[PDB]
From Swiss-Prot:
Electroneutral antiporter that translocates urate across the apical membrane of proximal tubular cells in exchange for monovalent organic or inorganic anions. Involved in renal reabsorption of urate and helps maintaining blood levels of uric acid. Mediates urate uptake by an exchange with organic anions such as (S)-lactate and nicotinate, and inorganic anion Cl(-). Other inorganic anions such as Br(-), I(-) and NO3(-) may also act as counteranions that exchange for urate. It comes from Homo sapiens. This is Solute carrier family 22 member 12. The gene is SLC22A12. It comes from the Eukaryota. Belongs to the major facilitator (TC 2.A.1) superfamily. Organic cation transporter (TC 2.A.1.19) family. Disulfide bonds: none annotated. The chain crosses the membrane at residues 1-15, 107-127, 135-155, 156-176, 193-213, 221-238, 255-275, 282-302, 311-331, 339-359, 370-390, 399-419. CDD domains: MFS_OAT. One of its GO terms (biological process) is cellular response to insulin stimulus.
Length: 421
């Protein structure tokens, strides 16, 4: 009774935590924009007017003819940008003009968020040890709620990034304490099931985010809505690494497990946080991510049970990488196929997360098990921090970030073939 109720509450918390993580692709979606031109803001056709007021692009994002030319002089967006509000009424990109010259700020915002996750885990470890895990979890709920509300009403971009950093600082503690509490009260034999249940809670959070963002098209309102439930969550909440590396034989397993954690984190947080490239419809992609993760993670658990631990992880990582590579390979015209491939890739990445979480426990003796799992978690968080950054390589071509996202998991899975069991 108590175990199931606690599991349900923590599943709800994880759903909302996934919402916090994945909100960025909605609250930071880049709308179609253009320099604010006077002649565009003898009237003629809007298409013709825009043709004589904005140079053509591969509709140029950030240029405008100095004087309306009827038919070099192109100049930057001196007066600002005009954002298309057909989908989103407001966004951080539209609010702070994170386009073109300052385009790197959005992926940099996502990197700051993930660095906040890393720092929050690092601090909450010793804090959760020093103070009760339940107390730290309650304080993390409170911090998540307040940081989300503040970042919703952030006046300037540095303030928004700072409060996203503190929000991540809090979510790291939330995740740490939720996982620890689930582990403590669950029988050692039932650990794979509990891990799968938590991952399924995250999958449900994907669709929850999709629905909330669909309803609330204002980034301020979206952030505030996703942050409010943590107020209620707070209300009703009431063997060192040196030795691990020293051992000679362990080095192979340690390196490969850490590489797998890093590959999962990098690929997921570099792809999951930018679904605009993956598919045309962000809401549909967000929904399908969870809709496929559910069966994907269930099948991952089934294969893990019957097909084995190592081959299941290898298959999941290879599937993710190959699907991402195909997505960047198949023609951009075939949008449906690319969206399906991206959904399959994210499902495989989630399955790989389940597999590695349930596998790294077995790979190492009980004395070093906690240290190995912690090292894997830290590597995953570092890869997450590096995830959004590689999207900056898209300036040369949008295919390069996806090529990196695909070749990382493929190589990690191939390396996963050397694991013992
Ligand atoms: C930081 C991560 C990647 S975890 C994490 C931290 C913060 N935000 C989300 C996740 C996360 C990402 C994908 C998941 C999936 N699928 C997932 C499932 C359950 C719990 C968290 C996640 C790690 O620990 O290395």
């Amino acid at each position: 009774r108590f175990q199931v109720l606690q599991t349900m509450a923590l599943m709800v918390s994880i759903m909302w935590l996934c919402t916090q993580s994945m909100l960025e692709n909605f609250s930071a979606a880049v709308p179609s924009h253009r320099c604010w031109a006077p002649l565009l803001d003898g009237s003629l056709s809007p298409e013709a007017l825009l043709a004589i007021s904005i140079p053509p692009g591969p509709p140029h994002q950030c240029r405008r003819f100095r004087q309306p030319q009827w038919q070099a002089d192109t100049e930057p967006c001196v007066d600002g940008w005009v954002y298309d509000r057909s989908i989103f009424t407001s966004t951080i990109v539209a609010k702070w003009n994170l386009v073109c010259d300052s385009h790197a700020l959005k992926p940099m915002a996502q990197s700051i968020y993930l660095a906040g996750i890393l720092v929050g885990a690092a601090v909450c470890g010793p804090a959760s040890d020093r103070f009760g895990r339940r107390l730290v979890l309650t304080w993390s709920y409170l911090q998540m709620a307040v940081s989300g509300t503040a970042a919703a009403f952030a006046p300037t971009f540095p303030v928004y990034c700072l409060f996203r950093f503190l929000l991540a600082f809090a979510v790291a503690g939330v995740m740490m304490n939720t996982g620890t509490l689930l582990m403590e009260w669950t029988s050692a034999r039932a650990r794979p099931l509990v891990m799968t249940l938590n991952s399924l809670g995250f999958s449900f959070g994907h669709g929850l985010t999709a629905a909330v963002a669909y309803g609330v098209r204002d980034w301020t309102l979206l952030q505030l809505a996703v942050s409010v439930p943590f107020f209620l969550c707070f209300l009703y909440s009431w063997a060192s690494l040196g030795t691990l590396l020293r051992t000679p034989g362990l080095r192979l397993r340690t390196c490969i497990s850490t590489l797998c954690w890093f590959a999962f984190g990098f690929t997921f947080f570099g792809l999951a946080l930018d679904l605009q490239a993956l598919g045309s419809n962000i809401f549909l992609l967000q929904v399908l991510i969870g809709v496929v993760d559910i069966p994907a993670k269930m099948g991952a658990l089934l294969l893990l049970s019957r097909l084995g631990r190592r081959p299941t992880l290898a298959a999941s990582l290879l599937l993710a990488g190959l699907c991402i590579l195909a997505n960047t390979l198949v023609p951009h015209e075939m949008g449906a196929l690319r969206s399906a491939l991206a959904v399959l890739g994210l499902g495989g990445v989630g399955a790989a997360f389940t597999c590695i979480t349930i596998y790294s426990s077995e790979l190492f003796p009980t004395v070093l098990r906690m240290t190995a799992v912690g090292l894997g978690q830290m590597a995953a968080r570092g890869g997450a921090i590096l995830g959004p950054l590689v999207r900056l390589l898209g300036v040369h071509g949008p295919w390069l970030p996806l090529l990196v996202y695909g070749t990382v998991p493929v190589l990690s899975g191939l390396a996963a073939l050397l694991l013992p069991e």
